[PDB]
Amino acid sequence: NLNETGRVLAVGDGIARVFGLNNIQAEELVEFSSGVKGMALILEPGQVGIVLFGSDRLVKEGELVKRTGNIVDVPVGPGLLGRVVDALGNPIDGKGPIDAAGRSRAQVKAPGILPRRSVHEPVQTGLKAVDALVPIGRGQRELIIGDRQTGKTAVALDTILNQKRWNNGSDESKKLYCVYVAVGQKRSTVAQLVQTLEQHDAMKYSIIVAATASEAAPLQYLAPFTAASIGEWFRDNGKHALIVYDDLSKQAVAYRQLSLLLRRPPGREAYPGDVFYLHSRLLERAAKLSEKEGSGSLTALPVIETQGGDVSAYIPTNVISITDGQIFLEAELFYKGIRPAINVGLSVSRVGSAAQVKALKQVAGSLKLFLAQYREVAAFAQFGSDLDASTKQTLVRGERLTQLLKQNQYSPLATEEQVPLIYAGVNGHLDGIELSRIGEFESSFLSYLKSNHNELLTEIREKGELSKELLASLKSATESFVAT
Amino acid sequence: ANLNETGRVLAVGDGIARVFGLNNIQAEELVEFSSGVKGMALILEPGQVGIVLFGSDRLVKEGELVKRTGNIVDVPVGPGLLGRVVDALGNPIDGKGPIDAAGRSRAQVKAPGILPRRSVHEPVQTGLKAVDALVPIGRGQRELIIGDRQTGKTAVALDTILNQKRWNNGSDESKKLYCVYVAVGQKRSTVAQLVQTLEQHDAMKYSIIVAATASEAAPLQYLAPFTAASIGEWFRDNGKHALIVYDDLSKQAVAYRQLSLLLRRPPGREAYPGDVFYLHSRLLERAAKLSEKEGSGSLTALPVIETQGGDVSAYIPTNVISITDGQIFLEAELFYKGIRPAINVGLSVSRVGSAAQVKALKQVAGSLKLFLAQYREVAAFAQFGSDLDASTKQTLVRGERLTQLLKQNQYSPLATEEQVPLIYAGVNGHLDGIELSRIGEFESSFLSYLKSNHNELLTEIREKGELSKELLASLKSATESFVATF
Amino acid sequence: QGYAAEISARRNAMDNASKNAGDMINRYSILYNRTRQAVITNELVDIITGASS
Amino acid sequence: TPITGKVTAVIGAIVDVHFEQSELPAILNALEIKTPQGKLVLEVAQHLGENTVRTIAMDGTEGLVRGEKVLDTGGPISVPVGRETLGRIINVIGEPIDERGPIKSKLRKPIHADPPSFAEQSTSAEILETGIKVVDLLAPYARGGKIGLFGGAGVGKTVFIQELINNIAKAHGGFSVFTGVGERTREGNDLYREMKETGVINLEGESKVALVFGQMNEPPGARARVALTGLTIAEYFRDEEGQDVLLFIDNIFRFTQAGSEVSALLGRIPSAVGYQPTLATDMGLLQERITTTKKGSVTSVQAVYVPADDLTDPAPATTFAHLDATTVLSRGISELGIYPAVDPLDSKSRLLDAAVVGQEHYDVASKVQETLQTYKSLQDIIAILGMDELSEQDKLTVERARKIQRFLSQPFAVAEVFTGIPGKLVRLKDTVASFKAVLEGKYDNIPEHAFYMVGGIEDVVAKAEKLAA
Amino acid sequence: LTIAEYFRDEEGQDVLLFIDNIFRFTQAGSEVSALLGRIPSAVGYQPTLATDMGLLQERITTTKKGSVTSVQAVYVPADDLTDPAPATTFAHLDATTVLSRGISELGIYPAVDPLDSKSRL
Ligand SMILES: Nc1ncnc2c1ncn2[C@@H]1O[C@H](COP(=O)(O)OP(=O)(O)NP(=O)(O)O)[C@@H](O)[C@H]1O
Ligand SMILES: Nc1ncnc2c1ncn2[C@@H]1O[C@H](COP(=O)(O)OP(=O)(O)NP(=O)(O)O)[C@@H](O)[C@H]1O
Ligand SMILES: Nc1ncnc2c1ncn2[C@@H]1O[C@H](COP(=O)(O)OP(=O)(O)NP(=O)(O)O)[C@@H](O)[C@H]1O
Ligand SMILES: [Mg+2]
């Protein structure tokens, strides 16, 4: 009887050819007699292609493979919070069993055209530069992109940290639960990252799904998908998650390995014929559900890594097309001291000022378009000539905003902190101050505002807007601190 | 039909002939076909054998017989080859009878391990002022000669092989350096003319020529440097010394790419097979200075690599750079400007030379290597002109003087003793006065003068190998003495 | 006078600039030509691989 | 009675053995063939079906015949482990190759082991000082972490490896493993000699360092596996002896290259640029083993070859993932005389944070980078038009950066034969203060060449006067 | 498109068709051609790019019963108009509106290129 069980025809490179398994489903789990697991990805007339989830020293020819009856799935629910798990939801932080409120599939459909609501609620990063110029909303997909070592995880990490402000409060609809997906990373990094989150007491609201470097390809392939499912639970029950795919480049490499070893015919750059669908189906699962569905949200921050800034490449392009916007990171800017290395010209959040606190939008109008006209003048002064009433103004101005949007790592800022700093910069109370001193202006103008103008800051925090009266007080306080 | 010792041709084409039978045949065993053409069994499969031909496809029909040899692809090695010209497999082509075979060795052998080797100390004297001063080579060292088309690459190899005549007319096997020259993919006429030139210098008598030329089967070109290595090795495993020149390895690689691609092996970078690095590695590792325990015999390799548009960052160039113990790089720019040899001092290094160099040369050459690269950099900022400097303007004179001094006529390899006086006159500066159009004169004028007058020094340099302060001040005097008269 | 000297300075400065630029061109013409080729090679390997099956 | 079969195919390194019994040897198992002179080891890589296994050979396969008898050893290729290896040169299959007979070891571990789990990880942020200005200042190494030395052919990877074994390995007072992967035999021989002379190996005493070699003369199978052998001996000190081990691997690139040479013959469809589809997991299965557990620590420095000077070639591209510290050697730099040829921007360290190195240390290196990026941002304006067309600010930051770039070049003790100069070993605290001063403008009037190939700030002035009269 | 063709041939009215994005049509064929195991064409596209486009586009036409006017968004991959996809699109058009990043980054909306954008009329 070969309906439920198949013998092994041939095994090599995390692939196994099995004979039998007749009533098996496409993408069903399997157990090998040795205990290793696998996934039936190819069903042909004579045999079944199975990707292994573990070492193929443990498979031999003639061995007995068993149906599970199960399409690939994971434990899901609020029990996962604080824990660290592998691609299949097994615990790896060595703290024992997970508390599953259920079991979502690995591959769930995205929500269709109907069960959805426009993106309007801000996901606050604390990064002065992001929340002013590329503001990320609830249900959004915002790509973090750039070369190796340009602050890609750094940007997403500072968002997770920041949410602490609301995650410690009781208010369950202001909260944001975090899922970090590490695909292809070495284990010494993931461990060192979970520790960083623990330090900032941010692990409690965070789930770490990991499919690290040594792991079989299908486990790196699967990790963003089952992590979605983990994160989807929050969206599906009136709560809001934020998932981070760090990075999708490595996932794509894993998927190409599977397929080439399954001898599925390659496409462009030896990649599978649908290495777009891979990402497009994944990234459509980040949604903002309708009221009829509880108004929950999955927000995604995929990471992609470019070789030499080549945003023209296959995968970086694929993913640029999927997402609702991009944050570009550049070594050229990074090493010039600008941190985060956010390329203000290329970076957009298409959900835009609809995904941003009112009190920020008002002070940050045309701040991105202005910083765009600033480089335009900086290239006019590249062939250095005389500076007039117009040019000598905007160069000195824009040098100070660029400077003001520098920001220390591990240091997010509240919106009532960002709002005065930007008004201070944009309206022109920074221009006669030495460029080299804006650093101390940030720390000094905030300490000043916390004593006297505490009226302003808690007003700005609570009502999220600005009145003609509130801005009048912000006009004063800034002039009131100009001569020291 | 004896399917154990015999085969039948199943198919042939793309230089490969698939053969049924030949059951007991070894991997990489040589075979002989009905036509006479020989082949090599490279693929041993259940039911048939993949065999790569050492000749033209035309000479193998389907159905034909395939005779075993009982031999891994091998060569006739030994001293009875000296003076002969052979193809890749050992067969003679200079029409001078059968080869006086001391015995046979495998084409492919493992290079000696970590232990049976000795660090290089004995100099390989080229006779080239520029080489013997700035990139000195040692017996066991492998030195890449790399450059563009027509840059005097072979010239450097040829003058070296000629220069060896010095030590090859005496009893001392320890001082003798027999020569192997490997012609891979060259024009047949070029080699003919090159062998003739060896004969016109009585150098042929101590050298062996291995030639698989431009019309010859790729597997004969890929093979030649390997069988050649075996020929060189006989002198190595017998306490003697030998120099093997691979001319060139570019063409070898292209041939081995031809072989690989027609065999269906995946094209990688520049469509080269995966193991093209290993192709050259295992060859170039076979040249080493053997230990005291192993008779101290040596093989010293000079591989030649042709770069395109002077791009040293190409795949095969960087590959061979990553194998060899250094590279003598010839600029086309300097060669076209009349500076021959055209050694770029910036891009040339001997990695083990300072320990192999003749101790007397090292002493007079003090920071000349490091100097020239500094001068040629200074002469770059010398674009003006309206800013004529007084300071480094004297290094600009030294430079042009030393540049002039290192220039060498092809086929003028000077003795090591004829070298140090010239370099002493350059480095120390007894040349900053002499006109640039009369340094070549100064050279012949100063050798004749020393040869007749201070022959006692020229004999002491040759036999001591050093320079004592008494002989250094002796040279000093004879230098200023000749300077006062020119 | 100042005018005249300048003309000579611009003659000489552009004499140097367009010689450096020319030198850059030669170098980059080698780098273009290599990238030209590896781009043809790589596309072809990619295609040829796509029929390995 | 052991488990024996018959060779059925031989193509290059690949050996197809069929077994006529029910049991088939596991993937990763060592199989033997008695040769005319020695024994040929094969390693099971895949089960082909119909009772045949495909294996990679560990040595050349000339002379092998179809039908030939083959013995299953019952386990993966095994090597000697313990203190028994120190002073000894070891092969890829665990044999001694230093002509000093047997290695009577306490145990013999298999080279294939699963890498330490995630909860088995233990992390920290400790600078490993090197006495090398560039690394210490701009991109410092992690104690108990992984370090990568990137370079094209001849830019100085191996010399940089030696200086480190010379600076850190004697001083260390732990144990060290040197595994030569697909490099020059001449260099292994040279290393062997130098160790004996430095006392780091005392042939007739005790030693701090075991050596493993699989040099570029060895067939693909050997160059593929020898890295794991050296790794196995390394791990054994970390886990059983709880020690802090130093693993030096030149060259780690040769491991992937080797895998590519067989990958075709294993019947894998080629990947980008003809590499194995398994390139990234293959690298993980090695690299993830090299790490710091709770039981003990491993600090590894690895030289990485770069084909055709291409940092985006799949092999070294994939490695960047595994490295806590990267120092990248640029040909462009090495060709300006600046040794070591470290790219002061392209090189990166995990540890360059103000709260690991000090805010004071952090600020210096940051501005150095700022400066060096500005000189880079003008390179072409200069190369074409010269200094004359630059604004006075720029012209100054270029005069400063030109000094800075030469100041990062340093005479290396092991490079004495090439320098002609005695080797210096600047201290981390020295390196910072020195460069802080130069940033503060204190040495603008001084000749640039006074900064070339020196130690710390005092050497600059010391040599500046030598350049006076 | 089949919903459009009905109004043109049955109601005989001038139908409007708005497609977004046309590029995806091509990109998806590329995926299925790949998966059907065809040998990929240049830039990895389907070997039937032109005729697959022809088949679709030639249906969008004015017949002697009614009209189909269609406006189509065309994603141009990596800002590159020579990519085989948009390259193959041009041929089928009557007028073209090219949107240029250099126009939109200066702050000009609509980001139209007043020279690249062409028209029959
Ligand atoms: N705003 C900042 N200020 C100062 N340092 C920073 C900042 N952001 C990032 N860094 C540092 O720069 C390094 C690189 O940042 P990282 O977040 O790793 O980017 P990445 O693109 O993920 N690198 P990788 O993942 O290894 O390719 C880290 O060591 C950071 O600590
Ligand atoms: N030192 C020299 N003085 C004068 N002529 C020389 C010198 N060296 C080489 N030549 C001549 O210059 C030409 C090129 O040198 P050659 O020895 O052919 O180098 P090559 O790089 O092997 N050229 P090719 O073999 O065509 O790639 C030949 O005609 C030589 O005879
Ligand atoms: N630190 C240094 N100081 C001075 N000169 C150096 C230094 N490093 C390398 N060089 C010079 O450049 C060469 C570099 O050799 P090596 O250190 O073996 O580099 P490599 O990159 O390992 N070469 P390969 O392994 O063949 O790709 C030496 O022969 C020296 O002439
Ligand atoms: Mg990261």
Ligand SMILES: [Mg+2]
């Ligand atoms: Mg030649």
Ligand SMILES: [Mg+2]
């Ligand atoms: Mg090296």
